[PDB]
Amino acid sequence: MVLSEGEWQLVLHVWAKVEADVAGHGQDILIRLFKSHPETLEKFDRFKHLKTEAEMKASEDLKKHGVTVLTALGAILKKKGHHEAELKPLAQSHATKHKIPIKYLEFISEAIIHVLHSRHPGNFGADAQGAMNKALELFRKDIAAKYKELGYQG
Ligand code: HEM
Numbered sequence: 001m002v003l004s005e006g007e008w009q010l011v012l013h014v015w016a017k018v019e020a021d022v023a024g025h026g027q028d029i030l031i032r033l034f035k036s037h038p039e040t041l042e043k044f045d046r047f048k049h050l051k052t053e054a055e056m057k058a059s060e061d062l063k064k065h066g067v068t069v070l071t072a073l074g075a076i077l078k079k080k081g082h083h084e085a086e087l088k089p090l091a092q093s094h095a096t097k098h099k100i101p102i103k104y105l106e107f108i109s110e111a112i113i114h115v116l117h118s119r120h121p122g123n124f125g126a127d128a129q130g131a132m133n134k135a136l137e138l139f140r141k142d143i144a145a146k147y148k149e150l151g152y153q154g
Contacts, residue, residue, distance in 0.1 A: 001138050025115060
């Protein structure tokens with residue numbers, strides 16, 4: 001997959017909006033993931049005691065982890081597909097330490113798109129959604145290729 005220069009422009013335009021409130025976006029994306037797919041919460045030893053949305057929103061540590069996640073994803077997207085070097089440490093930890101299937105990356109991709117609609121209702125149209133879906137699919141396909149490079153079936 002290759003994005004047009006126009007599609008990358010759209011992705012980076014949207015990402016400038018996430019960067020204005022990284023902690024808010026990151027907290028919402030993780031809660032959305034955990035509510036929609038509660039099996040993913042069991043992968044987080046630090047958070048799996050949290051049982052309800054209201055407990056999750058009160059967790060300062062969940063919020064900090066949201067910042068960690070979006071900061072790495074942002075550095076990757078700014079490379080406009082030339083991201084091999086940035087992917088390698090991410091693929092390494094998620095395949096070999098956390099043991100996260102690619103399917104769970106599809107679930108967090110759906111949570112990102114849901115939260116971008118919920119936080120930017122007039123600012124995230126069909127064209128920007130299409131470009132972001134393509135950039136996140138590019139990311140998932142390339143990280144699935146790095147899993148295989150490391151010897152894992154994602
Ligand atoms: C956009 C996709 C994602 C990005 C950019 C990302 C990024 C990160 C980063 C930067 C860290 C800390 C350093 C590291 O361990 O590598 C981390 C930790 C972790 N990730 Fe992800 N991650 C993503 C998706 C996922 C998903 C979907 C799951 C599970 C359902 C997951 C499970 C974990 C766990 C369990 C940790 C360790 C948490 C802890 O510190 O207690 N990751 N991730």
